[model samples]
Target: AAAXDXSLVEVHXXVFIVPPXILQAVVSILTTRXDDXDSSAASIPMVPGWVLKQVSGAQAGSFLAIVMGGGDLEVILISLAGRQESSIXASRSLAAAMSTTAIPSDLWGNXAXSNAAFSSXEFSSXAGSVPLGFTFXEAGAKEXVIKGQITXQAXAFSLAXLXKLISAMXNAXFPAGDXXXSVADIXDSHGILXXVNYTDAXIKMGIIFGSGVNAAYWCDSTXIGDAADGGXXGGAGXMXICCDQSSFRKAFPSLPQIXYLXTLNXXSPXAXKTFXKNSXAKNXGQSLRDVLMXFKXXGQXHXXXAXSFXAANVENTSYPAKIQKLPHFDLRXXXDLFXGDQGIAXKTXMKXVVRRXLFLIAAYAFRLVVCXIXAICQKKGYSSGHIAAXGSXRSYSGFSXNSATXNXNIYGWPQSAXXSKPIXITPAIDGXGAASXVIXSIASAXXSXAXXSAXXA
Candidate 1:
């Protein structure tokens, strides 16, 4: 339930990665609906989850999806930052092409995971004697950098309104990590005399941690996951909530290590200034947004003049051609450490930036943008939807008041680096729709919304 944010791609846009709803449904259905006589130990194989993998000719973001079923291996599907030359194995390519059919999978693919060159040995095929799937993995190797990419999404949006994003995270966490097994036959399947209920013990996972608020943010961790001191069980997957530490509680400012100020605090610098080549947060005036203390360069765009804002987008736009660091890392100072902040110690820009904008795992923005919007709304909003005052984005709006002075249609890069924005209708009503083709078009309006519905009384 943590609403961390932040990707975009730099390569051929032809390869679109999607977590096919069909595949999820098929998998979940197969797991829960048809398990009576089937092998409980069917030994599932892990592909790259083609729904979100993309192969780019340009540099890539070093990140990937890791899945552990029944609590097993730290199975990771790695990708390269400076993308590696494509191997003869169509690996990730076929996973995408193979899962084309939704309702079922043709025997051509999914017939056997053992045959797929992309699969790790321990894993098995995605289909059954008669099941099908909709599938990643070429870019399969690691960027093994120090920091990892983190992202936020809606239901999580660029990840949308942090309040909603966070609340959604908190809600889902609280729901998923109950004290015992998830309450449910998958609800109460006693067959007849006594009905059944299913309870989930939840799988545990150690998520990457960081601060996502754009204008201003803080990390407050009480030693408890479920707030209630006695409740040790909570969070998605089943890990202790408190164990999900973010930012630098592990080491403040990374134990005085200058490289760890990521969202930990914002330091400002004018990109136009000579120091521009030195400090991060270019012309990125995070502190000025009514926002600072170790802020992010992106925050400056939220308030500093239109061009600065455009610059943020410009970086985003240009990097699709460059695609490294999810386009978040500007060309001059490739990462947090190398930013102009430590320029006095660097040699040249080429190697300095090329240490590989590297395919480091994790995107740290909405968990990249929403985090940005949160602070803007908190600091300058005419109404004080301050953290203490609001729990979501639409808490107190009626005909008398609106969430903000502007119409909001936010945008960002989703799983596949396909960047887009969304403008929803009024929050006071309801809206929901879906597109079910190779590509989908879906819309959802809310009667009951997230924090404020994102702000309110």
Candidate 2:
């Protein structure tokens, strides 16, 4: 199964954001092709190896599309085997753009840095149904020169270092940090903002032990901040709250974690809510500024931890075989209630902040509660706490009612699960005030007791 020879034939371009997972999946497919070829009598071309070499080694490369900048521009490099004249083709002159932008400076540096280089050679099988062409040392050198010239001119037009820094900054801000401990709270401190919490060790450790650390933390903070904002309380925003955790604590807590790991209720919020928050004034007002603060902290964090958890896991857990796990919980629908806050087809600044806080808090509570349930079940199983046993827990469904009775005029507005009967209709409470208050009390008690035991054990 591991050694199947497959060919890397085509690269497709899509308009939607090519998530990091997609990028990795594409690479994996190409790699499988290479592996399959390795075991066969006829060589299968190494598309993934070649592409990676080219991408990392390429003077200029294509960027995957992102959401904010209207998505990624990608290059699909295909390898054809056994043909004398296999032409390299590209759409929209991207290859030319890369040559002009990335080649020159790299060539200049390569030639300037190295001397007395010797020629080395390797061979591989060609892909079926495709012709491969070989280039001589002299031809390769000439092509390298052309690529270098293009890169140098592009570099001169835009400073290579500056452009690299900007790209790095953008990537860091958009994605979650690898260190699980680093939260929005740390981002604020970098901007000289005084957050009440000096650090987020407890939060970091809690997230680190769980599978969905970063996402959980982000959701928890977002929910709390949003709830606070809606209730007319000041938490500033969740973005600021995220940064309180420091590097040392984060490292100690979520060591050797992976980026983009599975989180329970990954798509909890509705698409409409995501859209509202993205375009809302609260995000517009504080997103960039907060991102800048986080960027500096990200750089510092990377020095201590790997830049991403995905890469780390690939290196460490390549041989591990674990069953894929999914959360066992009913999905909660918050759409109708969320739409009610879409005042004037645009989220008010307060509404945006409230949404962010609510989302963050919801994630934290949900995950922590999940951990509690799982831990209790594990203990119960070990002690044989089955229904047949007298010591087994009672089977009772307790229905807790919400205290809020305020009614919104919008008929479309819907309350969360187990709607309060007193309200006679759905009631949307400030997530921070009502939601957080309820969840925190439960989750905190569970987390603290578990933490104490886990700490002791």
Candidate 3:
């Protein structure tokens, strides 16, 4: 409804530490199909209604299936990036896992206050037996069956797109200082009905990318449980969209805060760099740049190459094994304040050059690390255990594209440190993907198409 340029949605990667159950429910709700008309509370079976789009990837035999749903049209992309064709199978498995468990009435009532508006509807008659009004499950809800499927270039893209849409809807649905009870079901039913009847000239083209792929009104399982900071759902998750576009850097020179960490190792001398050492020390308790720089000095060649990039070659080919080897003992030190200090004192051009090369290096490092880990896992377990992104490597080179590129790539660290305490030792690295700004454009196109089809036959 708003005239703001729908194409302005940027593509970037993010990591969200959400409760497994909430995330599980969302994945289940979007994918599982319900068809039994006599099951009880009149439920809206959405799967049969979604408009599916399939796109081929840059790599041969690689492809993506895009499934668009919801009123504002949240997306669920089933793509392995290139890992395997098991995206659908894995999702079905997850949905099946969720379906088997008896979703306590408590889980359904998490949004009771939010669903209050729909209480007076005809469905309200079923309240005592099963809370009525667009509930996810049916009366005595049990099995959630998977029917059709739409694959995207990446799972990250699906989550990122849905995350943004949910935020957009939430922002528009509720007002300031009001405890918005806008539940996911409300978004699915009310908005889907609203959009189905409401139409505009907007039409989103069809294309999905892998690398480059939201806000306050967002609520996670933590929000419902009051586990989030200040009881606000916003604190339950954190996301960062890194636009790895050289062209983007040339155009607007992204916000300084985004690229500040690029200059972390760019200090000219050791004494002046003690600040970074302490900065790293503070964030990474036992580790310090003092130790890293010393190792860098021992391997002067690697250190020289890394610093040269910041000041501005592609050391992408060489394995920074020594750096990563030591890094296993340290934590990722976010240098926002330190990077800001440098940005204020340095020339814009110098900062640009440094950011660009550093990005290239980081991408390469992530690729290498994934490959090494995959190899090790294969050697030990005889098979890969996690959902791996196959297109990640090609995406590094796929960064080169035109303005019309509509690849929505966002790699979400959905399973990270905060996920479980027993597996705390494995520290997931902060990896960034480089791509143009067309991600938002395509998501809009996908949204428009999704919106159009839902509105039409």
Candidate 4:
């Protein structure tokens, strides 16, 4: 484990805008790995890795970033937010007429930029498969060239930086007359807007911690599509997973000290990789993280903290056992090996920020709350169903389920098993409003079984 062989790291970013109403949508990017020799790279694989999927208003935006002999498929969602509605409205003509023709029109106007990895023809041809076989080195180079202006002063892995790269990538992929690729109206009618893969109904929020760079995936339960566009009131319903590059142990409390360790796996490579390590001080100081973790450990937790610490402490000694200890918690069965094999230097660094920023520093600060829950969109099977609210200590399970087309009309409550209803259909008010405190206290009653300690609840 933690062996960085010929493994490839692929990043997929997608944004969807539902039709009829124009609503601003958040852009999300997901990370995963694909073997260079695996032909399955041409098609989507369900094997565990960082993944992000969102279905928004009618507009659809997506792009694929791959390393090695892998290909990428990118899309730019014409969301109701950001761009003028008239622009999306104007494109309807091209979208309507060019359903069969390869009309060259630039609905995105002068937003186009140049990138070697992006091409409309390639995207059109490989609509169903990852397009353009490119190596990690090539991808990084092209990404850098295109994003040099935006990421120059910031961490290359930062969400803001990645967003700029994505915007540029989509701009190039959907350049003028790019076969009506930017035409969301046409795509929605002909090809399903989000027919790329199943299980894309949930919104995905990602937090990338790039020290020696570690990745963690989780299946946390939360209401789906309830707080989206409808401004739903209450009644928890729906299920989703949230993910973070660092384990949720450290993610529980954003203000606590976060220890980021550089992993210099015992490979011949001179490069050291970054892996998320919990604040080592917490163990010694008996801080909130440790205490909160103690509660979760009762539910088979502490693996994330222990494994991360074990890796950080013994990685220098070329110990294979440390990596093994991490396998169970971080889903690093094979992807961990890729990190270990990569050549890089290891250096320990300490940074403490709000839990939201610590875990999900990839998108706009305004939407951090939504993305924080969205980040754990896939932790449903991670064993630790700890609904650690990144912010307000309570993960409000807004009552409502967002159906496919009826985003606003589908307000009926569905059973999501998140935090709410201490007695089945009762909606527990996490946020104080009226007489919701009783419900909040009761909601935490079952939180212990699910790893939601008093601190988490």
C-alpha RMSD values across all candidates: 24.9, 30.0, 23.3, 22.5
lDDT of 2 at 438: 22
Q: Alpha carbon lDDT of residue 353, candidate 4?
A: 13
Consecutive 10-residue window with the lowest summed lDDT within model 2 = 46-55
lDDT of 2 by residue, 1-457 (tens): 0111011001101211233343333323323332342333212211110100000111111111101101111111222122111212222212233333444353223211111110010112222211111110010111110010111221123324432212223223322322101010011111111100111111211111111111011112122212222221122222211111111111112111111111111332322222122211222212222321233254321123322222222211111101001112121122222233221121233223223333332222222212221222222222211101000001101101110111111112254642422122111221111111122222223333532101111
Q: Per-residue lDDT for 1-457 in model 3, tens only?
A: 0112111111111111123232233223212111111123212211211111122222111111211222111112122222122212111112222222344222223223233332333134432221111212111111111111112212212222221222223323334322222211221211121121112111111111222110001112221222222322133342111111111111112212122233333432222212122111111211222222333465421222333222211122121211222222121211221134222222233222223333333332232122212222222232212211222222333222210011101112233333221111121110111010011212234443532211121
lDDT of 1 by residue, 1-457 (tens): 0112111122101111112232222223222211211123221111011111011223222121111112121212223223231111222223333323332222122323322333433234432211111111011111111111223221111222231211122223322322111010000000000000001111011111111110111111122122222121121111111111111112121121122223314432211211111111221222122111112343411123223322221232122112242334334433333333222223333322232222211111111212223222222231222221111122211200221211121222132311211221122100000000000000001111210110111
**Which whole-number lDDT from 0 to 100 does residue 127 have in model 1?**
29
Write the candidate numbers in order of decreasing lDDT. 4, 3, 2, 1
Candidate maximizing TM-score: 4
lDDT to native, each model: 0.19, 0.19, 0.21, 0.22
**Model 4 worst lDDT run, 10 consecutive residues:** 182-191
Model 1 score (lDDT) = 0.19
Q: Indicate the residue-level lDDT of 451 in model 2.
A: 22
Model 2 per-residue lDDT at 98 = 35
